[PDB]
Amino acid sequence: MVKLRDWQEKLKDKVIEGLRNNFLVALNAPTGSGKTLFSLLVSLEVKPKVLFVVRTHNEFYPIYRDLTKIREKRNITFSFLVGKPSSCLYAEKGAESEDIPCKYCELKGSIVEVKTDDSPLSLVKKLKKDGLQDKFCPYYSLLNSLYKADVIALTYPYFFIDRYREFIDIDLREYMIVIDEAHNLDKVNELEERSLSEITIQMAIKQSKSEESRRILSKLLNQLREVVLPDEKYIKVENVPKLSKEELEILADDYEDIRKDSLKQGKVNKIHIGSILRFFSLLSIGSFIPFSYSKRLVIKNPEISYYLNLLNDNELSIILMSGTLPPREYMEKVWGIKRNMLYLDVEREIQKRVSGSYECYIGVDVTSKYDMRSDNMWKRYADYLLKIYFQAKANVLVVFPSYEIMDRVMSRISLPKYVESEDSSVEDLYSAISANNKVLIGSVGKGKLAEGIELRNNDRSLISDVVIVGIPYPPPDDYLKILAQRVSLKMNRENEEFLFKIPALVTIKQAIGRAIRDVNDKCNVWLLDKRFESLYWKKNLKCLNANKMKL
Numbered sequence: 001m002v003k004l005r006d007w008q009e010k011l012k013d014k015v016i017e018g019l020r021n022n023f024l025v026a027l028n029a030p031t032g033s034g035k036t037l038f039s040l041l042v043s044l045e046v047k048p049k050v051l052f053v054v055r056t057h058n059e060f061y062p063i064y065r066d067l068t069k070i071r072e073k074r075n076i077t078f079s080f081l082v083g084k085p086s087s088c089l090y091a092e093k094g095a096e097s098e099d100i101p102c103k104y105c106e107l108k109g110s111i112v113e114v115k116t117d118d119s120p121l122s123l124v125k126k127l128k129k130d131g132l133q134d135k136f137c138p139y140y141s142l143l144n145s146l147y148k149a150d151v152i153a154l155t156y157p158y159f160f161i162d163r164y165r166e167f168i169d170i171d172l173r174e175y176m177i178v179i180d181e182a183h184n185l186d187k188v189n190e191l192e193e194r195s196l197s198e199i200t201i202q203m204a205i206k207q208s209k210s211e212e213s214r215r216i217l218s219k220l221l222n223q224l225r226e227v228v229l230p231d232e233k234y235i236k237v238e239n240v241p242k243l244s245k246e247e248l249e250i251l252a253d254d255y256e257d258i259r260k261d262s263l264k265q266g267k268v269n270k271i272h273i274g275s276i277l278r279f280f281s282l283l284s285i286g287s288f289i290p291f292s293y294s295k296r297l298v299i300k301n302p303e304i305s306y307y308l309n310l311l312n313d314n315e316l317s318i319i320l321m322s323g324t325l326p327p328r329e330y331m332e333k334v335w336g337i338k339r340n341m342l343y344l345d346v347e348r349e350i351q352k353r354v355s356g357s358y359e360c361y362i363g364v365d366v367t368s369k370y371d372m373r374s375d376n377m378w379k380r381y382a383d384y385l386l387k388i389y390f391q392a393k394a395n396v397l398v399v400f401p402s403y404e405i406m407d408r409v410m411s412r413i414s415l416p417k418y419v420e421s422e423d424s425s426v427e428d429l430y431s432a433i434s435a436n437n438k439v440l441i442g443s444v445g446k447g448k449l450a451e452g453i454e455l456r457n458n459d460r461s462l463i464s465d466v467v468i469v470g471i472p473y474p475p476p477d478d479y480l481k482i483l484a485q486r487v488s489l490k491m492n493r494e495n496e497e498f499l500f501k502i503p504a505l506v507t508i509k510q511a512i513g514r515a516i517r518d519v520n521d522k523c524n525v526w527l528l529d530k531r532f533e534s535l536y537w538k539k540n541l542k543c544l545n546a547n548k549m550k551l
């Protein structure tokens with residue numbers, strides 16, 4: 001401990017004791033408020049070791065830094081694991097973990113002792129260089145270092161996906177478990193969801209080394225065109241193309257050939273047929289449902305509880321934290337958490353905000369509701385964006401309900417803009433808004449755009465205005481209907497909050513949090529949908545003083 005913030009000082013004992021009484025602790029504290037140091041500090045008082053489960057590798061550094069300025073009368077070593085398409089000496093970007101043919105590698109068993117005497121990401125760069133020279137595998141070296149460390153940091157999949165959790169060699173019962181940005185627990189299923197697309201099959205056919213393989217692929221391609229639609233919503237598919245045990249063996253042979261060869265050229269690229277094979281094997285497990293989505297066949301498990309049941313294990317001490325945790329009742333019915341839980345809200349505890357503030361504007365002459373959407377509505381929305389852009393002190397972050405709506409609106413704008421997409425990366429974003437001055441950033445609520453980085457320059461937010469076009473509600477498609485039934489919740493007024501409002505609120509609050517972090521930050525938030533004027537939204541988005549506006 002070294003000078004704690006007011007909230008940290010007031011909750012430390014409460015949390016430590018709570019964890020000792022076997023309660024799962026849910027901590028609602030804004031990102032950047034010191035929850036990482038807090039969790040580290042309390043965890044060490046509860047158990048001998050600590051496991052941090054985070055969204056990305058970028059969250060590794062603060063843990064590393066906090067630990068080296070923490071006080072403990074004993075040695076505490078830290079270690080971490082980065083993905084294998086990230087630590088493999090012969091992996092090129094785009095390579096899937098399963099695509100790395102470690103079997104045929106002469107480094108599969110060659111490891112060296114690893115010491116985190118430098119920032120995690122820097123250490124990885126060093127291991128890859130020393131690994132090529134000294135002849136050793138960085139991945140296996142890091143993997144092997146885990147069980148000896150006192151504090152370890154891993155990404156979500158290694159905790160929630162069995163296939164990856166098995167790779168790890170730790171008891172778990174001896175670790176205090178800290179799950180960061182826990183609002184993401186709703187999307188754990190995305191961690192193993194498989195997809196099948198026409199583009200992937202063609203690339204598989206182009207990368208093939210077997211015509212007999214290209215044969216089966218060509219056929220699969222035609223059948224796929226009949227079970228997918230462009231609709232940006234999940235439509236259940238009952239007639240998934242079939243692949244016999246024999247056809248699969250033929251495809252598997254082509255996969256093996258490519259893998260072995262790529263490792264020979266020391267260049268492991270994404271092997272397309274691989275995702276195809278993985279799609280069908282997962283489809284056989286039985287827990288997944290196939291759906292059409294944006295011209296692709298996607299398989300996913302609608303039951304959120306499927307991945308979180310591990311959180312109910314009484315032999316595990318757990319802290320879940322985020323700036324926007326859903327309410328307790330939601331964690332019970334939707335996440336399926338049944339064990340005793342202590343739910344703390346940092347700001348409510350210190351009776352003051354620890355996050356920035358904002359002026360709010362509600363547009364009441366627009367809406368994204370189905371009954372009014374038209375080309376004219378999209379034009380009104382584009383006009384709002386221009387108006388907001390012109391008066392913005394800096395960059396403008398726009399959150400759309402879907403890629404379809406973002407396109408209908410953004411396509412009408414000639415101002416400097418950066419539109420999110422599958423290729424969109426962190427540096428591309430940070431760059432764009434660093435080569436055009438004020439930029440209109442187009443993003444879709446379904447995340448998939450940085451979120452694990454701070455858009456600040458010279459210690460000041462790069463985002464002056466956050467715009468919410470319509471309400472980012474999840475569509476009432478087949479995926480949500482099944483998710484609802486798996487939890488015994490009918491599609492009714494009563495359950496609208498749990499099924500539609502809470503995830504929408506999470507999306508909006510996270511976007512806003514992207515423009516503010518410190519108590520000193522200030523921004524404008526434009527809620528562009530007449531529906532936002534209702535007290536429910538003003539109360540929950542904390543803008544009871546919002547300004548009403550038109551045009």
Ligand code: SF4
Nearest residue numbers: 088089102105108137
């Ligand atoms: S260097 Fe070799 S053993 Fe290590 S992850 Fe790459 S292929 Fe696998």
